[PDB]
């Protein structure tokens, strides 16, 4: 018997992503090859341990898959090790601490408000739960990271790690300088490069596996793969005493199913077409951003290196409640998000967030910005309308999704 | 570009699960439904929070997915509460300790050589890393568990949390008796009933909703659904510290792909042709473990209430280990196990474990069981041979997959 119910549900969500404008950064649509991978028979098999070394027998295949997965991982990142298992960016973050620190240790991340992750040591997450928290921010001017501040707070803190990488910080990150303030200290430098992991294997962004002692990152957002987390290592060593904290530390089997869909987002990323892909994300970035501050908007740091931006609201009167309310109501999406100092609370906040890798995916060029930009603009200042949703939609459909 | 390389380990994993007979008692065949759901575009979207308070707009279909799958496991279950968000059975168990207990508190579950999983105190896992860990055990005379002893260690441990439920026991559990227990030392009730669910759910196994605190499941396994976890609870006020904990505590963007797959499971589940199904399941492992006694081993209690059932292979004078490989070599999957009090040690150990569900969904039926007892005791004393191997596989490929 079909569940016809649920299935009607699974048509509403394709209707809804193919007739809307998904301007959340960190989203993307995955092509019909990852979701055959994560589709198949491969959920069928428990798979605790690690490839040539599993509790079970009936593996043969899919120590296979599962090698591919993790030597295409090396190959994409120039890493020495990778563990493919984590089944999430969270889950990747957890046996990473948990294999470098003690409860009670000090660990040191970007602020929540400054655009760092829930895992970067917010007291209601595990980060700040099991460990002490020092945040640093940005500077209240160029709205850019101080190195000056963040080694005064390593000197003075004695963090046990340190965490570069955020979830929405729109500028580069300078691995070296953080690297140098964590050696001072005696620390391991980790860095979380989840949002712009698709962009360091396209050679878009500076890669950290050089600098950092570990690297964690989701394979969704800029890597476009299916919802999975990663761990990447230059020391092998090291790496080893983190697989014991994935198994049998804090997962049990793996879902291997993932594991095949993160290898077809591997080889996919390793086409010429991905370094086209992800060169267009970052135009159309900088050309939105362009485009919103010519009608008046302010961009956080005045622009971006990346595939994201944030947009102060402050001076227009919105709430980014409010301006992501009227977006959805046309069928735009984004996020609220707090912006550097933000004067009103995280479940209101002052901002937006927006980033292009998914419109990207839907084959949006960076002289198709103005037309976004205009509709956004209108959202904003005249509200929803049944004419705004239609125009949305018009466009949206005019693209096709994978 | 098609991955053909990944393309083709798959289509030889889909082959390697035809052509086997899989007795290992936590695996399944999950449908093409399930599979659908699971490789549907709803991997796309990204909605940290709950129904109706999450952190992205663009929920609002999403929402409906998650609130069937909550109701329908309320409903199969009969339970005031559920969360369908955990991305494991690991991770269901960590959200659950961390919400009731704190770094060092007391923790009793079942000892890993007794039945116990990782989860309920290894010293490897972080339940074992987090809390002190007592451990409770089985009688050598009976084979059973001691209420008695469980009594006394919880008396002179006061341990904040008891877990009930294994991975390898084969009886029935006293819930009611357990739960007086607990609220003696005023410790909380947890059951992890993974293994077991899909029985709870047809009625066939004692439910321990209204006797446990709380209630922690995986949806594969008996319940034959997608790898991921679940957890449930007659309190509501319980389940929002627990939800808490889920998110933002220990997890980030839920995988709402697999719950609209959970959503598909518990459908099929509350459907009457599963309550068949699973009435099958016990009737195959009694029938196999009579059918083997015949033979000549040795059933650990002598006989099961449940899907799965050990073998003393002692009176062959075979290790499990043994067992394991000459059953590998001819495509008959199993897991080595000890028997109470084995005099082997934990690598090698005097048993395996069988269990009936995979084969059951294949259509197997408790008259072929006669058969089935008579390959593995063949494969067993004469060891792998070319014409075993093809008897096994022409009986395989004779029961389709789903």
Not at 2 to 20: M, P, T, V, W
Not at 376 to 396: K, Q, T
């Amino acid at each position: 018997k079909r569940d016809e119910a649920l299935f009607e549900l699974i048509a509403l969500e394709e209707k809804r992503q193919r007739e809307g404008l998904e301007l959340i950064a960190s989203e993307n649509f995955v092509s019909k090859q990852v979701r055959e991978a994560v589709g198949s028979v491969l959920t069928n098999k428990y798979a605790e341990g690690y490839p040539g070394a599993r509790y079970y027998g009936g593996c043969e295949v899919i120590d296979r898959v599962e090698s591919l997965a993790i030597e295409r991982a090396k190959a994409l990142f120039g890493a020495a090790w990778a563990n493919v298992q984590p089944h999430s960016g969270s889950q990747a973050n957890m046996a990473v601490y948990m294999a470098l620190m003690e409860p009670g240790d000090t660990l040191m991340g970007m602020d929540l408000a400054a655009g760092g992750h829930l895992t970067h040591g917010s007291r209601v997450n595990f980060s700040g739960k099991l460990y002490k928290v020092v945040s640093y921010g940005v500077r209240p001017d160029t709205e850019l990271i101080d190195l000056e501040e963040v080694r005064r707070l390593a000197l003075e803190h004695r963090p046990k790690v340190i965490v570069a990488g955020a979830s929405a910080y729109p500028r580069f990150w300078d691995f070296k300088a953080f690297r140098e303030i964590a050696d001072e200290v005696g620390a391991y430098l980790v860095v979380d490069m989840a949002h712009f992991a698709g962009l360091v294997a396209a050679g878009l962004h500076p890669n950290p596996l050089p600098y950092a002692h570990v690297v964690t990152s989701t394979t969704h957002k800029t890597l476009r793969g299916p919802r999975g987390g990663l761990i990447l290592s230059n020391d092998p060593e090291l790496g080893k005493r983190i697989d014991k904290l994935i198994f049998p530390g804090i997962q049990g089997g793996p879902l291997e199913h993932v594991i095949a869909g993160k290898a077809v987002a591997f080889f996919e990323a390793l086409q010429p077409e991905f370094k086209e892909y992800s060169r267009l994300v970052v135009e159309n970035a900088k050309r939105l951003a362009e485009e919103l501050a010519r009608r008046g908007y302010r961009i956080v740091t005045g622009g971006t290196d990346n595939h994201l931006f944030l947009v102060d609201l402050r001076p227009k009167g919105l709430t980014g409640k409010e301006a992501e309310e009227r977006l959805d109501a046309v069928g735009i999406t984004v996020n609220k998000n707090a912006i550097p100092f933000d004067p009103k609370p995280p479940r209101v906040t002052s901002g937006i967030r927006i980033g292009t890798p998914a419109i990207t995916t839907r084959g949006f060029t960076p002289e198709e910005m103005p037309l976004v930009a205009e509709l956004i603009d209108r959202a904003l200042l005249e509200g929803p309308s049944e004419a705004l949703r239609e125009e949305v939609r018009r466009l949206a459909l005019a693209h096709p999704m994978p």
